[PDB]
Symmetry: C2
Subunit: 97 residues, 2 copies
């Protein structure tokens, strides 16, 4: 019932894992090595992306919003986005139902 987003972080490869799940959300952790990129990603439901550690650039549509530690962004279902890690980053993705 208690997950640890900063415990077991590895910056060797791009890691995506489901740490926890309710029928309301899905809690996913993303470890991005510096330089890692996640292009074209499209989520089925609404999502909220927050940088727990590090720094990334979030790109949606035309804008490139740089997200430092603590930045949170919400997207609507079926919206095309991209993630570029400016630093070793740990991201928390909350996928909704």
């Amino acid at each position: 019932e208690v997950v640890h987003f900063l415990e077991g972080v590895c910056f060797e490869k791009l890691h995506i894992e489901v740490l926890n799940e309710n029928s309301s959300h899905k809690e996913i952790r993303i470890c991005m090595p510096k330089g890692a990129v996640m292009d074209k990603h499209k989520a089925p439901g609404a999502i909220s992306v927050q940088v727990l550690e590090g720094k990334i650039v979030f790109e949606v549509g035309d804008e490139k919003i740089e997200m430092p530690k603590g930045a949170l962004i919400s997207l609507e279902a079926q919206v095309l986005h991209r993630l570029d890690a400016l630093e070793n980053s740990v991201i928390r993705l909350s996928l909704s139902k």
Copy 2:
């Protein structure tokens, strides 16, 4: 499509609660907890998600007492009584679900 900054403008003088974002179903809240601050006997209407962005707190529900360091996340069901005690200057992100 909003961009909130949980760690921008953090103050540990007082226990601070702010609604950073709100949509028809969810609610994104920041909680700046000074060291030693308490949030006793709290009852949330919907399901909540509590995660420690900075610092350390203890989450208490019923009889069990979970220590939540930086990065720890916890989910609850609606209508569950809980308590938060800050062991260190902490910034908490709470996700409240409305209906």
